[PDB]
């Protein structure tokens, strides 16, 4: 029923393909990747293709999944766009606002479905925290708050995931925290300041992105956010936490559990699917893709699989298909670096309005 | 030898005159404070002084100690210099920069000590986190971060604490993290930005402080910090957190607790004098001087009563006498409210060269 074409099956890509070989009636027909196809593709036994061209314009393909490196998004989509092919691309869509933009108009004017990878917004304690929220268990929202901070040594080889010009730096490859704060608020922010520094990993045999990075999120409502990421931090933490006037949440993936504080009392809830999954996840952090994420690889996927075979989306993903998280996501990444650029705070106008 | 008058005592003034009188060779023989004077003047057996001038004038008068609400330190510091009496003053020393050079200023061309109560830099975990960084078992210091974040109630009656101009909202009123990042790092930032916004504590009953503060500060050797204060918080936080490229510091005295993070391994030092003053700190955040504190002030009055008596400061403490540690938090305090007041990022350089 729904064939797919995967461009790039390195780590990530090759994972979707699997799962999405799992599901009824979807099939993972060609692969699309100089240094990788040859072996997924005798692995999943399908056609290894010889350009990009030749993958978006089969007629083996109804579904281009693209899984590429973050800089390296944009032609696989104009293209699946212009051969009329659906199309689902890994996060961060882009590393600029207006080839983001370009992506969503190119799928918007052939009438085909773009599919966001914003895969956190699948996270089991990111869909109740939201319901928590909508219904005002916590009261009315004040604050949002994340971090992604750990500690990385100097690697063997030095890969495309520390050249900002590549991934985009901490912002862009792990943008799902900033998605996950503007999700959870359901606003844009006028005003966005980013502050950072390349701290300890400068020199031969290092990247050249920032290692530490201090966001600060004002928005219309009077609602404030604050987000750090950085690979210098020998304290590590990774969380989102909401503060509301009645309580306050905290989903922490790194002491892998949820928290639903009230009146000075907690109650636990899931971040994953079951406490196995929580359970694995922070052991993990305390010592390859784990349990917790393959199943969000198999829930997204099916997820995209249903869309393509004609489900309603439920008003949670929404925003993946319509282009607006996306979209919103980058500009805040795009405001973000060029608070950091240009040491001054940044109003989201100068970024949805610059063209 | 010493005798003390103590202008203001209400909460803290009151204890400031109670465990000065504990040591050996100090007294206090007045005080001044309109509404609680005659009070504690007659608990103390001393002297309730009709007028400042009074006070600060008297023979009976070797040193001033200021515990007036935050507005209202300046006049009794220039009067006392005018008057050739030491000074003690408590946090934060003024609201202005300019207030505060002006009474560091009056103290030093009237020959007097002049010491500002700074008192978190008494604390044993930062004395110990101040010997661990200098020792060099964290490494190279790479970023500071802070919070002081909890949920504070409407109150029955409105007081000096919730006004802005009078307490200086959460910046000045509870500067002390702050000073702790400039006293840790040894430097003063040369970029200074916050964020800021009443969210929950506006309208009849309420101040009109900001309940929620974000700064972030840039400092010219590259070093990085992120401070939070507020009273809007249902998840609540404070700690001081060092992060160096060995390892990482974490002063937590919320959960009571000092950890040393080397190699992936913790090892817990006490944030206070002994593990009963933690842990009755700590049980207390679950749930008037408490023993932590009480056990500060002894140890601040002592060492204020040492110094008049001629004994050399501990180099942790001299700038508490020389005005820097002064000077460099108010400093910081004015462009972080020049930060929130004109949506912009403002350098050090606009505050301290503007005499
Ligand atoms: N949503 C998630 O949880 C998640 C997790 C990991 C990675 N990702 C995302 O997946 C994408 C790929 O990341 P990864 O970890 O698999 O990286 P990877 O380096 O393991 O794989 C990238 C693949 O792209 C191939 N490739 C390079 N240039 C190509 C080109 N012009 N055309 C086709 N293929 C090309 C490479 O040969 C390689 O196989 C990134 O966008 C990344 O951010 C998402
Ligand atoms: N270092 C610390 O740990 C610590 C702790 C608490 C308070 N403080 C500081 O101590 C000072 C006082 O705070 P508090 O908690 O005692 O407040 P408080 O409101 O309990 O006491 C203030 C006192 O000042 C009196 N007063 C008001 N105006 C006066 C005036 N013109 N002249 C003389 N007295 C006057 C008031 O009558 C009252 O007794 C503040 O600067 C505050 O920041 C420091």
Redesign the interface.
Known sequence: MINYGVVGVGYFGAELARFMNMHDNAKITCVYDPENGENIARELQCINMSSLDALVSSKLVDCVIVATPNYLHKEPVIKAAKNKKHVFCEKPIALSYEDCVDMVKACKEAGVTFMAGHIMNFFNGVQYARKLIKEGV?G?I??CHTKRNGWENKQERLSWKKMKEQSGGHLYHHIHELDCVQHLLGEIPE?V?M???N??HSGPGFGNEDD?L?M?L?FPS???A?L?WGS????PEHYV?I??????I?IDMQETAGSL??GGQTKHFLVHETQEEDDDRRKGNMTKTPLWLASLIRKETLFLHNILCGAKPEEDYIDLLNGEAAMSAIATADAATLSRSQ???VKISEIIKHT
């Open positions: 916590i009315e004040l604050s005003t300041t502050i950072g520094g701290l300890a530490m201090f600060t004002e009077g609602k404030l604050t750090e210098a931090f020998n304290w936490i503060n509301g006037t009645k309580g306050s905290k504080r009230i040491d001054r705070k």
